[PDB]
Paper text:
To demonstrate the hypothesized interconversion between the DZBB-fold and the OB-fold, we created their chimeric proteins by combining the design-1 and OB proteins. The sequences of the OB domains in the rL2 proteins from thermophilic archaea, Thermococcus kodakarensis and Methanopyrus kandleri, resemble that of design-1, while helix α1 is absent in the rL2 proteins. The sequence region surrounding β2-β3 of the OB-domain in rL2 was incorporated into the corresponding position of design-1, based on the superimposed structures. Through this process, we constructed six unique variations by modifying the positions and extents of insertion (design-6–11). Biochemical and crystallographic analyses revealed that two of the six chimera proteins, design-6 (tkoL2_v1) and design-9 (mkaL2_v1), adopt four-stranded OB-folds. The DZBB and OB fragments comprise approximately 40 and 60% of these chimeric proteins, respectively. Therefore, the monomeric OB-fold could be reconstructed by simply combining the DZBB and OB-fold protein segments, without optimizing the structural interfaces between both parts. In contrast, the reconstructed OB and SH3 proteins did not interact significantly with any oligonucleotides.
Here, we study fold transition between distinct β-barrels by protein engineering and structural biology technique. Here, we discover that the previously reconstructed ancient DPBB sequence could also adopt a β-barrel fold named Double-Zeta β-barrel (DZBB), as a metamorphic protein. The DZBB fold is not found in any modern protein, although its structure shares similarities with RIFT and OB. Furthermore, the reconstructed OB fold could also be converted to the four-stranded SH3 fold by a simple circular permutation. Thus, these ancient β-barrel folds (DPBB, RIFT, OB, and SH3) could be readily interconverted by a few feasible mutations through the missing-link fold, DZBB, indicating their significantly close evolutionary relationships.
Author numbering:
A (entry chain A), B (entry chain A): 6 to 55
Write the structure that this text describes.
């Protein structure tokens, strides 16, 4: 199934640099990750194999 | 730019459940995340806004 997490906080976001975000997975687990530029609190990201 | 991380270790993987993995982002940072079922060490995942 799809692995998605909601952006809870943007912790550190330099210009032209991907931010550090704290995200919450659908099981309720919260973790720090790197997320694409432009993401904001309340957005959702997917972790997908490439 | 794209945010990708290489799967370094599968820490916990129940059947029919997404595994806990330790991944390494392109800047060298390592973090625990949830990754899709079927991912194995050496695969690459992308974090993408949906």
């Amino acid at each position: 199934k799809k692995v998605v997490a909601r952006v809870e906080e943007i912790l550190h976001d330099p210009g032209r640099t991907a931010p550090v975000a704290r995200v919450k997975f659908e099981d309720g687990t919260k973790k720090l990750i790197i997320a694409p530029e432009g993401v904001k609190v309340g957005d959702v990201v997917e972790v997908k194999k490439v």
